[PDB]
């Protein structure tokens, strides 16, 4: 925040100080501008991109077992969770899609090196 | 139009045929009858031998794009699926 705590008037606040004993927080309104220009230089924060990228994470296969298990474990979870179809969340068709959503893609990415 | 399909069928069949055989298959008396064919069929062949070095067509242009496409498909499916994802809306 900001404080200056007194007025002209006001955006013209007024009373309390021609009535004296101005005291508060009295914040004022915040703003600030840069650009795009270093917007860019920012946003660069994330040759490059080949190599920090496709390539620069490829590495999957690594945990193909993980990949599976990970993958592998999203199963259980579920006949767990559709079971209690037989209240309130975690509910039996909930997590299901995003647990056995979230290792669908990450999967699929792998695909783009092969 | 018989024995075009035999011709087929010994394509098929065998790889490697006795000239006599074919001819024999083919009902024919003159084997350069069947030379003919075979090699009207366009078939490897050596004396006394109707061969099939390759018994078919294999490669030959088109069906392509789809159907073997490792990634691409793949990818294209990815894209699909991505539109799976993306259509998704």
């Known amino acids: 925040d900001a404080f200056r705590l007194i007025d002209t008037g006001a955006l013209i606040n007024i009373q309390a100080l021609i009535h004296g004993l101005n005291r508060h927080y009295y914040s004022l309104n915040i703003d600030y501008h840069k650009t795009a220009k270093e917007t860019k230089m920012l946003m660069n924060l994330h040759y490059e991109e080949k190599e920090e990228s496709n390539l620069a994470a490829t590495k999957s296969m690594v945990k193909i077992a ?17 079971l209690k179809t037989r209240v309130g969340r975690q509910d039996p068709k909930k997590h299901l899609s995003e647990t056995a959503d979230e290792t669908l893609e990450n999967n699929i990415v792998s695909v783009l090196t092969a | 139009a018989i024995r075009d399909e ?22 024919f008396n003159n084997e350069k009858e069947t030379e003919k064919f075979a090699l009207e069929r366009n078939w490897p062949i050596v004396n006394s031998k109707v061969y099939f070095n390759n018994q078919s067509k294999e490669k030959a242009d088109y069906e392509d794009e789809m159907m073997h496409e490792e990634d691409q498909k793949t990818n294209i499916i990815e894209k699909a699926m991505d539109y799976a994802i993306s259509i998704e809306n």
């Open chain 1, 66 to 82: 993980e990949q599976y298990s990970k993958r592998i474990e999203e199963e259980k979870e579920l006949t767990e969770e559709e």
């Open chain 2, 6 to 27: 035999i011709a087929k069928n010994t394509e098929l069949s065998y790889d490697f045929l006795p000239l006599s055989n074919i001819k024999a298959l083919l009902f």
